[PDB]
C-alpha cells in the first residue's frame, strides 16, 4: 500500500490538472476583468435591509388594510338589509331570480325549479382568477342536500340579493380583489365573481361535498377558540350501531377544530380513563388531531356505566393550567345513547358557577331514556343533539358553534374584528388563499328593543380572499442574490410566506389504503385542511433559529448575524453559510416579516445603460438565428412587461421577448425597466465573454461544455450542440448549481443524476462552476457564475495515467460533498456515476461517518408524495438526509476491519474544490458488508407526536374571547 | 331474552325489528316464529 507521499503527489497532481482545466476554460478571470473594466454602464446600490423590510411590512399592512375596509363594507349593508326584510312564505309568485352555482349552461335544460328562476350568464374569461368569471352577478352555492325552495332558503335568497351591489362596489374600488363570500348559517354561499363550481353533484359522477359551515374561515369568525374535551361512552350498551356512529361522529367533530383550540377525548365505562397517549388537552394541529383519530377508531364496548367518574375525569382535565391551553371556552362534549343517571353531585361540585358548558349528544337509535342527558344539557348552558345516522352526523356536529357564538353577539361592536386564517388551499382552485373575515349579526327589533329571540344568532359570516402571490408581489426578490429572500410567520410559528412552501396538502403518517375495499363509483372524500408548515419544518433548525422564531412570535423588532447550515435546492448537499435575519412586525397584524440576506449580497447591480445604441446592440445579442456565435441563450421566465407572460417554453419565451423589446421602444412605458435594462446589460456582458474569449478555441480537450449563467436572467452554453443537453431551470434563482457556487469560495462539482431517464452520464458530463466575484470600489459583489462539463472519459484516462482500470488489488474512488460518486477505477463503478458512495460501497462509507469526515442531517419533508404501502399518489412526511464535510483536515489514513478482514485505506482531500479521494484495499478480497445506507427520501412517519406535546413549541394565543354573557339565554336546548 | 336478548349488536345499520330486547318484543317474535312467516332470517340472525 502506497506511502502518504506518493498518494499526497497523485492528488496533488490530480487537482492541479481539474483547477487549471477549469480555471482557463470557463473563463472566471476573463468576465471578472470584463465586468470591472466597464464600471460605468451601472452603479453599485446598497440593500438596506432594515428598510426593505419596514417597506415591506408597509405594503403588507396597507393591502390587508384595504381588505379589512371591503369587509365592514359588506357586513354594514348586510345587517341593514336583513333588518328590513318581510319574511315571505308566498314565492311561488313573486320568484327569487338567482344564478345556481353548478348547473349546467347548455340552453336545452330550462329547470327553474319552483318559486325561483334562474340565470343564464355570459362568462368571460379571466386572469387572477384563472377560470371564467362574471362580473354582473354574485353565484350561489347551496349543499347538494339542502333543497332550494324551501321557505328558508327562499327567504334568505330574496334578502341577500341586496349584496351583489357592494360586491360591485368593493370590486370597483379595488379592481385585485378575488373572491368576496357570503356564508350564510342556512348553508348557503352567495360570492362574487359568478363562477361556474368546481364539482357539480349529479353532471358527472362526484359529488360534491362543500357546505360553508364547515370551513376554517367561517368556523373563525362564528366564535372564539375551545377548551373542548370529549367524553366518550363505551359502556356495553353502546355496543353495535350506536359504537360505529360514535366513532365517526367524533371523527367529524374533531374535523370542526383548528390550531388555537385544545382538545383531548377521554372515555368512560365505570372508570375513566384518556383514549389515546396524551393525558392532558392537546393543540389540535393536524398530527394531534391524527392521533386522536386514529385512538378513537380503536374503541370497543364492555362495562357498566358511571357518569359521575367520567364528568369527575373531564372536570380534573379542564383545570389543569400547568400546560398550554386557550383558556377561553371550556366546553365538554358527552357522546352517548341514553341512561337514568343525571349526575347533579358532580355539576353542584365542579361547576357550581356554571364556567363550563356541556353539550350532550344521543347517538343511534335505541330505546334507552334520554331525559337525563338532556337535563344535563339545559342546566350547563349547553345543548342536546340526536344522530340517528350517519347522514345525521355533519350537521349536528357543526351546530354547537350557535351556541358559542351568543356571548359575540351580545358583545355588539367590540366583536366585529377582522380575523385572518390559516393558508389553505382556494376550493375554486386558486391556488394557496388566506382569508379574511367578519361575523354578520341578526338585528332586527333592534331600534325598539324588541325581538331578542332569534337575535342571538349570526347570520353569517363575510370573507374575503387574498392569494399569497399577491403578497409576494410585495416582497419583490430580484435584487437579492439567489439565497436571499423574505418570509412570514403566525403568533403561532406557521409559514404564511416562505420558498419551501408549496401548494400541496400537509402529509401525516405513512399512506395506506386497502385496495380490496374500494368500489369503483363511489366518490371519496378528499380534504378541509390547510397548509400549515411551522416555521422550523421549513428550514434547518439551530437553537439560534429557535430563539429568533421566539423573538419575532412576540411581535418584536430586530436583526441578527450568525453561521448555519443551508440546504440545496435539490434536497442532496448542505452548504454552510453566514445569514443575516432581519425582522420586524406588520403593525396591523399578528404576522411578522423577516428578510434573510447572505452577506455579499449586501449590494447590487442597477444598469445605467442609457444611450439607445449600446442597448439596441445588446438587444441584438439575444436572436435564436446567431446563436451558433453567441451560443444557445435562455432567458429567465421573469415578468418583464406587464404584456408578455411566462411561456414555460423557453424559445417562445425568449421569441416574445424579443418581438416585444423592439416592437415597442425602450423608454420602457409600462414595463419594470430595470428588470429589462439589466437583462441587457448580462446579455451584453455574456456576449462579449463567448464572442472574445470562447469563441478563440472552439473546443478544448476534455471540456465538453461551457456556460455563464447570470443575474438579470441570461444563461448562455457555448456549443450550442451542448445547448440540448442543458436541463437546469432557466430561471437562474432556482438553479442549485448556482445557488451552491454562490455559498463557496472554490470550484464546486455537481453529481449527476443516476439512473435517470436521459443524457446524464457521458452524454453531458460532469458538471464544475465557479462564482465570478468581483470588486467595484471596495465592495464585493457576485453578479454571474461560470463553469463547464468535463468529458468523463478525458477524465477517467487522465485518471489512471496503483490502481489501474479493473485493478482488483483495490479502489480508487473520487467523491464530492456530499458522497456521491465522480471518477470510479473499476468500470463497473464508473458505470454508476452519481451514485451515493453507500450504495456501492457500504462499509467504508459508515466507518467514512465514522471517522468524522463525513458529517450528516436529518430532516422531515412534511409535503411529498408517496406510493401508498398494502395495510395515485397521496401526501406523506419523508425523512431526507444530507451528507457534507465537517472536519477541516486534509487527509485521513486508517484500515478498517470487518473482522476476519482489514483493508487499510487512506482518504485525502482535494484542495481548493470539494472533491476526496480515496484509496482503499478491494472488496472481492473478503466477504464482508452489512447493508447499504441510503441517502434517499425514505417514506416516514414520525416524529412521535406523544413526546412532542411534553415540550410544545413557544406560542401566543389570542387574547380576545368572548364567552360568558350573563344577559344569555340558553332557554333552547 | 337470555339467549339473544342484548346480542343483535351487529354493526351494519341494516335493521331488525324482530329481536328479543324487551318483553313485548320479544312476545312478538316468538309469535312470528309460530306463524312462521319470516322465521328463517329470525334464526339467521340468531345464528350470526
Same mark, same amino acid.
Given at each position: 500500500?502506497?506511502?502518504?507521499?506518493?498518494?499526497?503527489?497523485?492528488?496533488?497532481?490530480?487537482?492541479?490538472?481539474?483547477?487549471?482545466?477549469?480555471?482557463?476554460?470557463?473563463?472566471?478571470?476573463?468576465?471578472?476583468?470584463?465586468?470591472?473594466?466597464?464600471?460605468?454602464?451601472?452603479?453599485?446600490?446598497?440593500?438596506?435591509?432594515?428598510?426593505?423590510?419596514?417597506?415591506?411590512?408597509?405594503?403588507?399592512?396597507?393591502?390587508?388594510?384595504?381588505?379589512?375596509?371591503?369587509?365592514?363594507?359588506?357586513?354594514?349593508?348586510?345587517?341593514?338589509?336583513?333588518?328590513?326584510?318581510?319574511?315571505?312564505?308566498?314565492?311561488?309568485?313573486?320568484?327569487?331570480?338567482?344564478?345556481?352555482?353548478?348547473?349546467?349552461?347548455?340552453?336545452?335544460?330550462?329547470?327553474?325549479?319552483?318559486?325561483?328562476?334562474?340565470?343564464?350568464?355570459?362568462?368571460?374569461?379571466?386572469?387572477?382568477?384563472?377560470?371564467?368569471?362574471?362580473?354582473?352577478?354574485?353565484?350561489?352555492?347551496?349543499?347538494?342536500?339542502?333543497?332550494?325552495?324551501?321557505?328558508?332558503?327562499?327567504?334568505?335568497?330574496?334578502?341577500?340579493?341586496?349584496?351583489?351591489?357592494?360586491?360591485?362596489?368593493?370590486?370597483?374600488?379595488?379592481?385585485?380583489?378575488?373572491?368576496?363570500?357570503?356564508?350564510?348559517?342556512?348553508?348557503?354561499?352567495?360570492?362574487?365573481?359568478?363562477?361556474?363550481?368546481?364539482?357539480?353533484?349529479?353532471?358527472?359522477?362526484?359529488?360534491?361535498?362543500?357546505?360553508?359551515?364547515?370551513?376554517?374561515?367561517?368556523?373563525?369568525?362564528?366564535?372564539?377558540?375551545?377548551?373542548?374535551?370529549?367524553?366518550?361512552?363505551?359502556?356495553?350498551?353502546?355496543?353495535?350501531?350506536?359504537?360505529?356512529?360514535?366513532?365517526?361522529?367524533?371523527?367529524?367533530?374533531?374535523?370542526?377544530?383548528?390550531?388555537?383550540?385544545?382538545?383531548?377525548?377521554?372515555?368512560?365505562?365505570?372508570?375513566?380513563?384518556?383514549?389515546?397517549?396524551?393525558?392532558?388537552?392537546?393543540?389540535?394541529?393536524?398530527?394531534?388531531?391524527?392521533?386522536?383519530?386514529?385512538?378513537?377508531?380503536?374503541?370497543?364496548?364492555?362495562?357498566?356505566?358511571?357518569?359521575?367518574?367520567?364528568?369527575?375525569?373531564?372536570?380534573?382535565?379542564?383545570?389543569?393550567?400547568?400546560?398550554?391551553?386557550?383558556?377561553?371556552?371550556?366546553?365538554?362534549?358527552?357522546?352517548?345513547?341514553?341512561?337514568?343517571?343525571?349526575?347533579?353531585?358532580?355539576?353542584?361540585?365542579?361547576?357550581?358557577?356554571?364556567?363550563?358548558?356541556?353539550?350532550?349528544?344521543?347517538?343511534?337509535?335505541?330505546?334507552?331514556?334520554?331525559?337525563?342527558?338532556?337535563?344535563?344539557?339545559?342546566?350547563?348552558?349547553?345543548?342536546?343533539?340526536?344522530?340517528?345516522?350517519?347522514?345525521?352526523?355533519?350537521?349536528?356536529?357543526?351546530?354547537?358553534?350557535?351556541?358559542?357564538?351568543?356571548?359575540?353577539?351580545?358583545?355588539?361592536?367590540?366583536?366585529?374584528?377582522?380575523?385572518?386564517?390559516?393558508?389553505?388551499?382556494?376550493?375554486?382552485?386558486?391556488?394557496?388563499?388566506?382569508?379574511?373575515? *367578519?361575523?354578520?349579526?341578526?338585528?332586527?327589533?333592534?331600534?325598539?328593543?324588541?325581538?331578542?329571540?332569534?337575535?342571538?344568532?349570526?347570520?353569517?359570516?363575510?370573507?374575503?380572499?387574498?392569494?399569497?402571490?399577491?403578497?409576494?408581489?410585495?416582497?419583490?426578490?430580484?435584487?437579492?442574490?439567489?439565497?436571499?429572500?423574505?418570509?412570514?410567520?403566525?403568533?403561532?410559528?406557521?409559514?404564511?410566506?416562505?420558498?419551501?412552501?408549496?401548494?400541496?396538502?400537509?402529509?401525516?403518517?405513512?399512506?395506506?389504503?386497502?385496495?380490496?375495499?374500494?368500489?369503483?363509483?363511489?366518490?371519496?372524500?378528499?380534504?378541509?385542511?390547510?397548509?400549515?408548515?411551522?416555521?422550523?419544518?421549513?428550514?434547518?433548525?439551530?437553537?439560534?433559529?429557535?430563539?429568533?422564531?421566539?423573538?419575532?412570535?412576540?411581535?418584536?423588532?430586530?436583526?441578527?448575524?450568525?453561521?448555519?447550515?443551508?440546504?440545496?435546492?435539490?434536497?442532496?448537499?448542505?452548504?454552510?453559510?453566514?445569514?443575516?435575519?432581519?425582522?420586524?412586525?406588520?403593525?396591523?397584524?399578528?404576522?411578522?416579516?423577516?428578510?434573510?440576506?447572505?452577506?455579499?449580497?449586501?449590494?447590487?447591480?442597477?444598469?445605467?445603460?442609457?444611450?439607445?445604441?449600446?442597448?439596441?446592440?445588446?438587444?441584438?445579442?439575444?436572436?435564436?438565428?446567431?446563436?451558433?456565435?453567441?451560443?444557445?441563450?435562455?432567458?429567465?421566465?421573469?415578468?418583464?412587461?406587464?404584456?408578455?407572460?411566462?411561456?414555460?417554453?423557453?424559445?417562445?419565451?425568449?421569441?416574445?421577448?424579443?418581438?416585444?423589446?423592439?416592437?415597442?421602444?425602450?423608454?420602457?412605458?409600462?414595463?419594470?425597466?430595470?428588470?429589462?435594462?439589466?437583462?441587457?446589460?448580462?446579455?451584453?456582458?455574456?456576449?462579449?465573454?463567448?464572442?472574445?474569449?470562447?469563441?478563440?478555441?472552439?473546443?478544448?480537450?476534455?471540456?465538453?461544455?461551457?456556460?455563464?449563467?447570470?443575474?438579470?436572467?441570461?444563461?448562455?452554453?457555448?456549443?450550442?450542440?451542448?445547448?440540448?443537453?442543458?436541463?437546469?431551470?432557466?430561471?437562474?434563482?432556482?438553479?442549485?448549481?448556482?445557488?451552491?457556487?454562490?455559498?463557496?469560495?472554490?470550484?464546486?462539482?455537481?453529481?449527476?443524476?443516476?439512473?435517470?431517464?436521459?443524457?446524464?452520464?457521458?452524454?453531458?458530463?460532469?458538471?464544475?462552476?465557479?462564482?465570478?466575484?468581483?470588486?467595484?470600489?471596495?465592495?464585493?459583489?457576485?453578479?454571474?457564475?461560470?463553469?463547464?462539463?468535463?468529458?468523463?472519459?478525458?477524465?477517467?484516462?487522465?485518471?489512471?495515467?496503483?490502481?489501474?482500470?479493473?485493478?482488483?488489488?483495490?479502489?480508487?474512488?473520487? *467523491?464530492?460533498?456530499?458522497?456521491?460518486?465522480?471518477?470510479?477505477?473499476?468500470?463497473?463503478?464508473?458505470?454508476?456515476?452519481?451514485?451515493?458512495?453507500?450504495?456501492?460501497?457500504?462499509?467504508?462509507?459508515?466507518?467514512?461517518?465514522?471517522?468524522?469526515?463525513?458529517?450528516?442531517?436529518?430532516?422531515?419533508?412534511?409535503?411529498?408524495?408517496?406510493?401508498?404501502?398494502?395495510?395515485?399518489?397521496?401526501?406523506?412526511?419523508?425523512?431526507?438526509?444530507?451528507?457534507?464535510?465537517?472536519?477541516?483536515?486534509?487527509?485521513?489514513?486508517?484500515?478498517?476491519?470487518?473482522?476476519?478482514?482489514?483493508?487499510?485505506?487512506?482518504?485525502?482531500?482535494?484542495?481548493?474544490?470539494?472533491?476526496?479521494?480515496?484509496?482503499?484495499?478491494?472488496?472481492?478480497?473478503?466477504?464482508?458488508?452489512?447493508?447499504?445506507?441510503?441517502?434517499?427520501?425514505?417514506?416516514?412517519?414520525?416524529?412521535?407526536?406523544?413526546?412532542?406535546?411534553?415540550?410544545?413549541?413557544?406560542?401566543?394565543?389570542?387574547?380576545?374571547?368572548?364567552?360568558?354573557?350573563?344577559?344569555?339565554?340558553?332557554?333552547?336546548? | 331474552?337470555?339467549?339473544?336478548?342484548?346480542?343483535?349488536?351487529?354493526?351494519?345499520?341494516?335493521?331488525?325489528?324482530?329481536?328479543?330486547?324487551?318483553?313485548?318484543?320479544?312476545?312478538?317474535?316468538?309469535?312470528?316464529?309460530?306463524?312462521?312467516?319470516?322465521?328463517?332470517?329470525?334464526?339467521?340472525?340468531?345464528?350470526?
Amino acid at each position: 500500500f502506497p506511502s502518504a507521499v506518493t498518494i499526497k503527489s497523485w492528488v496533488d497532481k490530480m487537482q492541479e490538472d481539474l483547477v487549471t482545466l477549469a480555471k482557463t476554460a470557463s473563463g472566471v478571470h476573463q468576465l471578472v476583468d470584463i465586468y470591472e473594466k466597464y464600471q460605468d454602464l451601472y452603479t453599485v446600490e446598497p440593500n438596506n435591509a432594515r428598510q426593505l423590510v419596514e417597506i415591506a411590512a408597509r405594503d403588507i399592512e396597507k393591502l390587508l388594510s384595504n381588505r379589512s375596509k371591503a369587509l365592514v363594507r359588506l357586513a354594514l349593508e348586510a345587517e341593514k338589509v336583513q333588518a328590513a326584510h318581510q319574511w315571505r312564505e308566498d314565492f311561488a309568485s313573486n320568484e327569487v331570480v338567482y344564478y345556481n352555482a353548478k348547473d349546467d349552461l347548455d340552453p336545452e335544460k330550462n329547470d327553474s325549479e319552483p318559486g325561483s328562476q334562474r340565470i343564464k350568464p355570459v362568462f368571460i374569461d379571466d386572469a387572477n382568477f384563472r377560470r371564467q368569471v362574471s362580473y354582473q352577478h354574485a353565484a350561489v352555492h347551496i349543499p347538494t342536500d339542502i333543497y332550494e325552495g324551501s321557505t328558508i332558503v327562499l327567504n334568505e335568497l330574496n334578502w341577500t340579493s341586496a349584496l351583489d351591489d357592494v360586491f360591485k362596489k368593493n370590486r370597483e374600488e379595488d379592481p385585485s380583489l378575488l373572491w368576496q363570500v357570503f356564508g350564510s348559517a342556512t348553508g348557503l354561499a352567495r360570492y362574487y365573481p359568478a363562477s361556474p363550481w368546481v364539482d357539480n353533484s349529479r353532471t358527472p359522477n362526484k359529488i360534491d361535498l362543500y357546505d360553508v359551515r364547515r370551513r376554517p374561515w367561517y368556523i373563525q369568525g362564528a366564535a372564539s377558540p375551545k377548551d373542548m374535551l370529549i367524553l366518550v361512552d363505551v359502556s356495553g350498551s353502546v355496543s353495535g350501531l350506536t359504537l360505529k356512529l360514535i366513532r365517526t361522529s367524533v371523527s367529524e367533530m374533531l374535523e370542526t377544530l383548528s390550531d388555537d383550540d385544545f382538545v383531548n377525548v377521554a372515555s368512560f365505562n365505570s372508570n375513566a380513563q384518556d383514549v389515546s397517549c396524551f393525558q392532558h388537552l392537546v393543540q389540535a394541529n393536524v398530527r394531534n388531531k391524527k392521533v386522536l383519530k386514529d385512538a378513537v377508531n380503536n374503541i370497543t364496548a364492555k362495562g357498566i356505566t358511571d357518569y359521575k367518574k367520567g364528568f369527575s375525569f373531564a372536570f380534573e382535565q379542564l383545570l389543569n393550567y400547568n400546560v398550554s391551553r386557550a383558556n377561553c371556552n371550556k366546553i365538554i362534549m358527552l357522546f352517548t345513547d341514553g341512561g337514568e343517571e343525571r349526575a347533579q353531585e358532580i355539576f353542584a361540585k365542579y361547576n357550581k358557577d356554571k364556567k363550563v358548558r356541556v353539550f350532550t349528544f344521543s347517538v343511534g337509535q335505541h330505546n334507552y331514556d334520554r331525559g337525563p342527558i338532556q337535563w344535563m344539557a339545559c342546566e350547563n348552558k349547553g345543548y342536546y343533539y340526536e344522530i340517528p345516522s350517519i347522514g345525521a352526523i355533519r350537521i349536528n356536529t357543526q351546530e354547537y358553534l350557535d351556541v358559542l357564538g351568543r356571548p359575540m353577539v351580545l358583545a355588539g361592536d367590540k366583536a366585529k374584528q377582522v380575523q385572518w386564517t390559516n393558508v389553505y388551499l382556494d376550493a375554486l382552485e386558486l391556488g394557496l388563499v388566506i382569508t379574511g373575515t *367578519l361575523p354578520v349579526f341578526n338585528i332586527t327589533g333592534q331600534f325598539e328593543n324588541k325581538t331578542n329571540l332569534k337575535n342571538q344568532l349570526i347570520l353569517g359570516v363575510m370573507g374575503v380572499d387574498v392569494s399569497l402571490e399577491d403578497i409576494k408581489r410585495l416582497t419583490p426578490r430580484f435584487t437579492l442574490c439567489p439565497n436571499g429572500y423574505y418570509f412570514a410567520i403566525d403568533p403561532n410559528g406557521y409559514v404564511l410566506l416562505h420558498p419551501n412552501l408549496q401548494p400541496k396538502p400537509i402529509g401525516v403518517g405513512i399512506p395506506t389504503i386497502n385496495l380490496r375495499k374500494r368500489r369503483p363509483n363511489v366518490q371519496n372524500p378528499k380534504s378541509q385542511e390547510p397548509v400549515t408548515l411551522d416555521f422550523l419544518d421549513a428550514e434547518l433548525e439551530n437553537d439560534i433559529k429557535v430563539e429568533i422564531r421566539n423573538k419575532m412570535i412576540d411581535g418584536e423588532s430586530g436583526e441578527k448575524t450568525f453561521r448555519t447550515l443551508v440546504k440545496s435546492q435539490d434536497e442532496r448537499y448542505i452548504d454552510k453559510g453566514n445569514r443575516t435575519y432581519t425582522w420586524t412586525p406588520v403593525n396591523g397584524t399578528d404576522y411578522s416579516l423577516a428578510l434573510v440576506l447572505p452577506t455579499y449580497s449586501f449590494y447590487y447591480i442597477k444598469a445605467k445603460i442609457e444611450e439607445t445604441i449600446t442597448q439596441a446592440r445588446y438587444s441584438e445579442t439575444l436572436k435564436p438565428d446567431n446563436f451558433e456565435e453567441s451560443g444557445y441563450t435562455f432567458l429567465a421566465p421573469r415578468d418583464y412587461c406587464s404584456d408578455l407572460k411566462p411561456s414555460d417554453n423557453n424559445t417562445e419565451f425568449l421569441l416574445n421577448f424579443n418581438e416585444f423589446i423592439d416592437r415597442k421602444t425602450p423608454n420602457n412605458p409600462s414595463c419594470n425597466t430595470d428588470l429589462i435594462n439589466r437583462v441587457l446589460l448580462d446579455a451584453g456582458f455574456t456576449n462579449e465573454l463567448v464572442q472574445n474569449y470562447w469563441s478563440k478555441q472552439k473546443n478544448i480537450k476534455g471540456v465538453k461544455a461551457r456556460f455563464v449563467v447570470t443575474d438579470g436572467g441570461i444563461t448562455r452554453v457555448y456549443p450550442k450542440e451542448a445547448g440540448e443537453n442543458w436541463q437546469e431551470n432557466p430561471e437562474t434563482y432556482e438553479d442549485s448549481f448556482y445557488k451552491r457556487s454562490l455559498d463557496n469560495d472554490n470550484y464546486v462539482f455537481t453529481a449527476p443524476y443516476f439512473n435517470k431517464s436521459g443524457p446524464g452520464a457521458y452524454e453531458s458530463g460532469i458538471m464544475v462552476s465557479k462564482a465570478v466575484e468581483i470588486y467595484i470600489q471596495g465592495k464585493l459583489l457576485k453578479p454571474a457564475v461560470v463553469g463547464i462539463k468535463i468529458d468523463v472519459n478525458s477524465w477517467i484516462e487522465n485518471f489512471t495515467k496503483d490502481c489501474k482500470r479493473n485493478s482488483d488489488v483495490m479502489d480508487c474512488v473520487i *467523491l464530492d460533498d456530499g458522497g456521491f460518486l465522480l471518477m470510479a477505477n473499476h468500470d463497473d463503478y464508473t458505470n454508476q456515476i452519481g451514485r451515493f458512495f453507500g450504495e456501492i460501497d457500504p462499509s467504508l462509507m459508515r466507518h467514512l461517518v465514522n471517522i468524522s469526515v463525513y458529517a450528516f442531517n436529518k430532516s422531515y419533508d412534511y409535503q411529498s408524495v408517496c406510493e401508498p404501502g398494502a395495510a395515485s399518489k397521496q401526501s406523506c412526511i419523508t425523512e431526507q438526509t444530507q451528507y457534507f464535510f465537517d472536519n477541516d483536515s486534509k487527509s485521513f489514513s486508517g484500515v478498517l476491519d470487518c473482522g476476519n478482514c482489514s483493508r487499510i485505506f487512506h482518504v485525502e482531500k482535494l484542495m481548493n474544490t470539494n472533491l476526496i479521494f480515496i484509496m482503499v484495499e478491494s472488496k472481492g478480497t473478503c466477504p464482508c458488508d452489512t447493508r447499504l445506507l441510503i441517502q434517499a427520501e425514505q417514506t416516514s412517519d414520525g416524529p412521535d407526536p406523544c413526546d412532542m406535546v411534553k415540550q410544545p413549541r413557544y406560542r401566543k394565543g389570542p387574547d380576545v374571547c368572548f364567552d360568558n354573557n350573563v344577559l344569555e339565554d340558553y332557554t333552547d336546548c | 331474552m337470555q339467549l339473544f336478548g342484548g346480542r343483535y349488536d351487529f354493526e351494519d345499520t341494516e335493521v331488525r325489528r324482530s329481536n328479543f330486547d324487551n318483553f313485548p318484543q320479544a312476545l312478538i317474535s316468538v309469535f312470528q316464529v309460530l306463524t312462521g312467516e319470516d322465521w328463517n332470517s329470525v334464526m339467521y340472525n340468531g345464528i350470526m
